[PDB]
Design a protein around this nucleic acid. Structure first.
Ligand code: GTP
Ligand code: MG
Ligand code: MG
Ligand code: MG
Ligand code: MG
Ligand code: MG
Ligand code: MG
Ligand code: MG
Ligand code: MG
Ligand code: MG
Ligand code: MG
Ligand code: MG
Ligand code: MG
Ligand code: MG
Ligand code: MG
Ligand code: MG
Ligand code: MG
Ligand code: MG
Ligand code: MG
Lengths: 139, 191, 117, 45, 176, 199, 97
RNA sequence: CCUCCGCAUAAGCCUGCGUCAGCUGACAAUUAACAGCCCAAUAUCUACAAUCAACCAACAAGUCAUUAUUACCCUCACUGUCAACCCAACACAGGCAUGCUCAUAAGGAAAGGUUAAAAAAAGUAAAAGGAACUCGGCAAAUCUUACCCC
RNA sequence: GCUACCUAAGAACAGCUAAAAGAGCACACCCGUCUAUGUAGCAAAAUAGUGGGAAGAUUUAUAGGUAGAGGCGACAAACCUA
RNA sequence: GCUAAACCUAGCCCCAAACCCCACCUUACUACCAAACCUUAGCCAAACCAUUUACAUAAAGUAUAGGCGAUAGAAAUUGAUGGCGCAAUAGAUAUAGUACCGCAAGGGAAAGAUGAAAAACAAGCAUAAUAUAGCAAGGACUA
């Protein structure tokens, strides 16, 4: 969970449990060639790799073998009309290596006008012989 | 939206609207009389009569209502003509485009008299709020699915499974799922 | 020299970059030799229910009737949960009806709240 | 020979013009108060 | 499985995906805590799938198929969270009379401003907490001048706004 | 010594429907009572025996409007599908179109039919043209000598306040070639690139 | 080029709006009302110059005296500076003596 | 043809020559073992440099250690990881710590094209003479004595 | 964050000669004697050559300290963000 | 005919009335370890400067103070519905305390103009370089 105060744990205390998870993640096509067992996710910044492992293992029942994380810096170079820097949000990227020899590949997602088209068909482009003379007149 | 944004015919978030009103424009604000929400009497679908300009007297149907500028668009009325699809070579095609009309320039029409009428927001015991024509009486009426795989059935959505109890969702779910926790939360200091 | 850009862990020298985090909640502590000891109880445990047989869906059919919003209140909850028992026992020590004098002793204390979400 | 008097180092930057140091003394608190009154986006360096 | 991060294969490439309506707060209020708990994860999985769709659409430079369902899912999750928060608030008020889940106090910071300082969890008492003791929750007399200056700045802003509004109203009356 | 003064940087980092698409059923020049009823039931007042006179009047008045570039009236006199054909190629050039007595009475040919009317009228009239340039120099047709024109004019109507306006002129493949142009023209051959060779 | 190329929008002045029509009424309230009210009491404006006139220095002194305590901090600082400067100007500068 | 360099770390900056389509917008990317981020107390310990540490040599006397009890089963979290880069208003002949490469396996291009006027800068060569120049052997070339003032 | 000085804990000093050197020749490095160029310049003090030191009172990275009727100063009235 | 020119409202000025989720003092915006109160000075005037020098009405610029001089200065007593404002070099610095500049305190900008609907004449030059001689013009002249 994010944007919530974690109940402070003291030795011998109860297990910390989150019932309504606040984290929402994205599965993103890698920008570079990746091993067949690796899945790339975009994650909330406050989520740990342990949290991601538990999240995937519980909500999705995905057997996770390893998790690595890196914070990708968002560009702060673009400037608006007022010359004020526009910050692309920094995000977190997690690489999850599946277990039990399981393999994953990003699926191949994404595999009046009639009058306009018919008038374009009926354009009747002016012939060179007409020499710019309007051809509408029947004479 | 940016302050003093000039509402136009295009919706306030379309490509055309962004093109016409980029963030840096500072055009003079348009003066519009302050018609209260409880005094607005033109609605989408109302049959209206044009009082001024070309096609004055003709009665049409309101197609759009840009309330922020006291505008009503009468379908196929108050029309100029513009070219759509005009490319470098093709001249394009002529299309009739409606222009906005002010509520002062437009008046509602009696449902049966088919004549312009002045209107009042008179309360009625049955129709708590409804329009009433003044010059000839009568109330002008206000004009106006298959479940998918991820859509709940109506009966399921309306099933009242809630049992008012003094248990938090956390402990209720713990009881439901059988999670057993014996450790007692040690006290902490708040400040 | 950049005063406006947000201060993150990517900016300072090695010590600053190591020390500053990204808001991720801690999981354990550090012992001698910089060995990190991870406490299992500090790791949030996702209490995921069994969704098998669940009839609800992320969306609701538009055919559902419209209703008036009535935000739940303490008075409404008391009427719907405690009032029946109170009436039935009065017609014939509030802990019997549900009231607890103190939240201490409960795993889920209502105030100060000691549970996630 | 001159001009490059600024040899950046975040440690010195924060230890010389940081929020903690500005609040460390009453004068720096007034510095921050002046910046807030003026409406500065960056109160401390 | 990871297939739950993507819509049904039949819907891949569809220009439009037919969707229901977002859950309403009143509709959710009739559901049990267990039902809301399960619906939370149902909506979470749907939200993850829709966010994946949005990101892949951006990657492919193609319009997202039916983006409105993402807003519907977000609204449904917000409504469920609001219902749960309402139930928790009612129970907390009944059992303790506290309107706020997190302890806090009205305090005057070092700058003389009145703030609602939210308490934090500590293992040691405050009188022993060194860093907390370093923090200052009082304003010395030199801050009164700046407090007055800020008050006068606020008053000037308010007066300017009110005068502008009245002048605009007069201009409108003249025009009509 | 006096330090140099820098000016502000910004000073130097400034930087700069009521129509149809064509013809529903093309009439091929050398049983429409269903469409006649389909228009009667929606109009409540119409006379096929009298329509040709109104059609001829509208045709002549629209061409006279072309004479003066009265686009305001042309808009109501011709359909939007026809207006660009009426007025596009004639921009920036004066036209002296005139009408002279017809040769045979105009009569309807056939009629067909959210809902749009359609009437085909055959006219064999006599007309005159004199199309000039931007500079007022004749480039098409004698202004005095008239010519015989055979036309198949198709009107369309909107079915609430719409009227009958010229929609399209059907030119049969067997129609005689129009009047020859006055100025000689050239039709360039393929502008070949170096590698290309003429074929 | 410091001249506008179009006539400015016509300025219509209603000489018979209530304010102009009733302007000056009760200016003789004193002499025509048994002197119960002095005409200067009809003056509506700043409290420190109601029925009183003076040069800028006197006006500033009166403003400080009468509403100085209620002035904003920087406005009062500016008024004190203005009073000091006007004193210096009127008491040390000028053609005559 | 040049190689001042170059490759990394540090510091600094913060996406700043990756892809796509029109410098701009979008898309992608830096994955911890390397580094940072440490230590339960209470007392108690510790004279004998380094210098290949061995002769020897010292002086300026020097960078490295535990014990005795009591506590103590959860182990791999978080953050940096890109670049043609930073400080000099600049694609600035300047400044910029360290390890290797001691001239490179790495990195680069002094000439936009033409002509070959004066004047100007840098360089090479010079008949005979060899300081006659000049304030002064400044500069250049050679590899040169002896003496004064401070 | 420059510079004057200092504090903590670091780093650099090829090769040759002499032996233990505030020694000699001479790299890196530091400095800036003289000349020429430049003088709105590559540079708000630089470039090329030449030159002084280059195991020491040396040079230098990091953090900290001394603040203006003050600091610091191998006193040049030097330096303390051109 | 190019550069360009213009515009009217964004707002502002003076008054009156009225009193106005989470994170963050550690290297701020980082979940979680054994102490405040203390005379203002100076410029400036005295033609220097040294004592000294201002910070409702009426009494009254009076009594008084004062290198008795520049100047300072009471009290008793008296009773107390808006714009002959600005209109983009103006009016707030303000489109903004932003951009930008400085290590920091701090300094601190510029500018916009169509329409009911966009879902419709400065300078400088060019047209058109130039003719002996001259503060460039004046008297003139057919020129
Ligand atoms: N002199 C002046 N009169 C003002 C000012 N602002 C408002 N008014 C006057 O206030 C009166 C009442 O204003 P309205 O808007 O009619 O009424 P209202 O809102 O009840 O007025 P307020 O209580 O003053 O806010 C009018 O006569 C205004 O001219 C101002 O700044 N100066
Ligand atoms: Mg990492
Ligand atoms: Mg330095
Ligand atoms: Mg080159
Ligand atoms: Mg050249
Ligand atoms: Mg010779
Ligand atoms: Mg000799
Ligand atoms: Mg001589
Ligand atoms: Mg001589
Ligand atoms: Mg020499
Ligand atoms: Mg050596
Ligand atoms: Mg030596
Ligand atoms: Mg020294
Ligand atoms: Mg001396
Ligand atoms: Mg001297
Ligand atoms: Mg200086
Ligand atoms: Mg004096
Ligand atoms: Mg301005
Ligand atoms: Mg001109």
């Amino acid at each position: 969970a994010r944007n919530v105060v974690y109940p402070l744990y003291r030795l011998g205390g109860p297990q910390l449990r989150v019932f309504r998870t606040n984290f929402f993640i994205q599965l993103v096509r890698p920008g570079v060639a990746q091993p067949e067992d690796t899945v790339q996710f975009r994650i909330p910044m406050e989520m740990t790799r342990v949290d991601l492992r538990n999240y995937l293992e519980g909500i999705y029942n995905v057997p996770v073998a390893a998790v690595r994380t890196r914070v990708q810096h968002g560009s702060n170079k673009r400037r608006d009309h007022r010359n004020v820097r526009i910050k692309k949000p920094d995000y977190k990227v997690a690489y999850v290596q599946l277990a039990h020899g399981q393999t994953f590949t990003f699926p191949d997602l994404f595999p009046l006008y009639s009058m306009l088209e018919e008038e374009r068909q009926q354009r009747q482009s002016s012939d060179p012989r007409r020499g710019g003379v309007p051809s509408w007149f029947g004479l | 939206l940016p302050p003093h944004y000039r509402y136009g015919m295009s919706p306030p978030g379309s490509v055309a609207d962004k093109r016409k009103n980029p963030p840096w424009i500072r055009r003079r604000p348009v003066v519009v009389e302050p018609i209260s929400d409880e005094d607005w009497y033109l609605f989408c679908g109302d049959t209206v009569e044009i009082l001024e300009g070309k096609d004055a007297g003709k009665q049409g149907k309101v197609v759009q209502v840009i309330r922020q500028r006291n505008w009503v668009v009468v379908g196929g009325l108050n029309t100029h003509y513009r070219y759509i699809g005009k490319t470098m070579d093709y001249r394009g095609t002529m299309i009739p485009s409606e222009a906005p009309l002010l509520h002062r320039q437009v008046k509602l029409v009696d449902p049966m008299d088919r004549k312009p009428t002045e209107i009042e927001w008179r309360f009625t015991e049955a129709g708590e709020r409804v329009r009433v024509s003044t010059r000839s009486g009568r109330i002008i009426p206000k004009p106006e699915w298959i479940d998918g795989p991820k859509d709940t059935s109506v009966e399921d959505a309306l099933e009242r499974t809630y049992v008012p109890c003094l248990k938090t969702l956390q402990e209720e779910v713990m009881e439901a799922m059988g999670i057993k926790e014996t450790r007692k939360y040690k006290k902490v200091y708040w400040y | 020299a950049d005063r406006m850009s947000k201060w993150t862990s990517k900016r300072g020298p090695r010590s600053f970059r190591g020390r500053k985090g990204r808001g991720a909640k801690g999981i354990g502590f550090l012992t001698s030799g910089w060995r990190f000891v991870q406490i299992k109880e500090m790791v949030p445990e996702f209490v995921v229910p069994d969704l098998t047989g669940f009839k609800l869906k992320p969306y609701v059919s538009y055919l559902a009737p419209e209703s008036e919003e009535t935000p739940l209140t303490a008075a409404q909850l008391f009427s719907e949960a405690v009032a029946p028992a109170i009436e039935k026992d009065f017609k014939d020590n509030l802990e019997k009806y549900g009231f607890e004098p103190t939240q201490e002793g409960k795993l889920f204390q209502l105030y100060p709240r000691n549970f996630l979400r | 020979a001159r001009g490059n008097e600024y040899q950046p180092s975040n440690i010195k930057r924060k230890n010389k013009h940081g929020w903690v140091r500005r609040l460390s003394t009453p004068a720096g608190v007034q510095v921050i108060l002046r910046r807030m009154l003026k409406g500065r986006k960056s109160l401390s360096h | 499985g990871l297939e739950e991060f993507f819509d049904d294969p039949k819907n891949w490439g569809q220009e439009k995906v037919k969707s229901g309506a977002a859950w309403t707060c009143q509709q959710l209020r009739n559901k049990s805590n267990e039902d809301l708990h399960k619906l939370w994860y149902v909506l979470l999985k749907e939200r993850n799938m829709l966010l994946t769709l949005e990101q892949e659409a951006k990657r492919q430079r193609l319009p997202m198929p039916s983006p409105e369902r993402l807003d519907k899912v977000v609204d449904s999750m917000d409504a469920l969270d609001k219902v749960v928060q309402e139930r928790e608030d009612a129970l907390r008020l009944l059992q303790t009379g506290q309107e706020r889940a997190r302890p806090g106090a009205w305090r005057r910071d070092i700058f003389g401003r009145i703030i609602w300082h939210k308490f934090k969890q500590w293992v040691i008492p405050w009188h022993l907490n060194k860093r907390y003791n370093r923090k200052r929750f009082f304003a010395l007399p030199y801050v009164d001048h700046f407090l007055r200056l800020e008050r006068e700045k606020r008053a000037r802003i308010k007066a300017r706004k009110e005068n502008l509004e009245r002048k605009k109203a007069k201009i409108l009356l003249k025009k009509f | 010594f006096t330090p140099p003064i820098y000016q502000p940087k910004f000073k130097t980092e400034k930087e700069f429907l009521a129509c149809t698409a064509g013809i529903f059923d093309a009439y091929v020049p050398p049983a429409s009572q269903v469409s006649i009823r389909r228009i009667k039931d929606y109009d409540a007042n119409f006379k096929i025996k009298d329509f040709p006179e109104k059609a001829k009047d509208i045709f002549i008045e629209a061409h006279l409007c072309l004479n003066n570039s009265d686009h305001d009236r042309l808009h109501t006199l011709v359909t939007e599908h026809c207006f660009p054909d009426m007025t596009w190629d004639i921009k920036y050039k004066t036209v002296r179109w005139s009408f002279v007595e017809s040769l045979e009475p105009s009569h309807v040919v056939q009629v067909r039919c959210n809902v749009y009317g359609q009437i085909t009228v055959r006219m064999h009239t006599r007309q005159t043209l004199a199309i000039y340039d931007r500079f007022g120099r004749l480039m098409y047709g004698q202004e005095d000598v008239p010519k015989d024109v055979l036309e198949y004019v198709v009107f369309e109507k909107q079915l609430p306040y719409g009227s009958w306006r010229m929609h399209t002129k059907i030119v049969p493949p067997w129609a005689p070639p129009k009047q020859p142009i006055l100025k000689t023209v050239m039709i360039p051959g393929p502008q070949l690139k170096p590698e290309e060779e003429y074929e | 080029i410091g001249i506008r190329l179009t006539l400015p929008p016509p300025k219509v002045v209603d000489r018979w709006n209530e304010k102009r029509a009733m302007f000056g009424v009760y200016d003789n309230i004193g002499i025509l009302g048994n002197f119960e009210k002095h005409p200067k009491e009809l003056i509506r404006g700043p409290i420190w110059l109601r029925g009183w006139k003076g040069n800028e220095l006197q006006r500033c002194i009166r403003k400080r005296k009468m509403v100085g305590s209620r002035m904003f901090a920087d406005d009062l600082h500016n008024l004190n500076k203005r009073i000091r400067y006007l004193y210096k100007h009127f008491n040390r500068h000028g053609k005559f003596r």
